[PDB]
Write a protein that binds this ligand. Structure first.
Ligand SMILES: *[C@@H]1O[C@H](CO)[C@@H](O[C@@H]2O[C@H](CO)[C@@H](O[C@@H]3O[C@H](CO)[C@@H](O)[C@H](O[C@H]4O[C@H](CO)[C@@H](O)[C@H](O)[C@@H]4O)[C@@H]3O)[C@H](O)[C@H]2NC(C)=O)[C@H](O)[C@H]1NC(C)=O
Ligand SMILES: *[C@@H]1O[C@H](CO)[C@@H](O)[C@H](O)[C@H]1NC(C)=O
Lengths: 27, 50
């Protein structure tokens, strides 16, 4: 990854399906 | 058990009543179609994005 240690730490804490159904799309 | 559900409470897995096998369910490829044009003044060619 081209991130920094602080960026890597940040991206590993935002972590908390819904593929597609009934015309629900995610761009 | 015989049915299959998820968090959205929508059926997504069915047990075979004959051979006792667990199938899967998925909608078949719905989407939106959009075109790409460089401006009708310059040319009259387009590209299609699905
Ligand atoms: C629903 O009703 C049907 C109607 O009979 C019933 O299907 C048949 O059941 C019998 C046993 O009850 C099966 O006989 C064996 O089944 C085993 C397990 O599926 C197979 O492995 C055997 O066939 C193997 O070996 C053959 C020779 O080497 C191979 O050619 C074959 O491909 C297999 O590898 C053996 O046939 C019979 O196969 C089924 N019939 C079908 C079409 O599947 C079924 O049991 C009933 N279901 C319930 C839940 O009662
Ligand atoms: C189309 O593009 C050309 C490029 O030189 C330009 O001269 C012309 O004015 C354009 N058409 C319109 C209607 O503006």
């Amino acid at each position: 990854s081209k991130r920094s240690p602080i960026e890597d730490l940040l991206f590993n804490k935002v972590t908390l399906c819904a593929q597609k159904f009934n015309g629900l799309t995610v761009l | 058990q015989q049915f299959g559900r998820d968090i959205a409470d929508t059926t997504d897995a069915v047990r075979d009543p004959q051979t006792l096998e667990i199938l899967d369910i998925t909608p078949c490829s719905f989407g939106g179609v959009s075109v790409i044009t460089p401006g009708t003044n310059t040319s009259n060619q387009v590209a299609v994005l699905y």
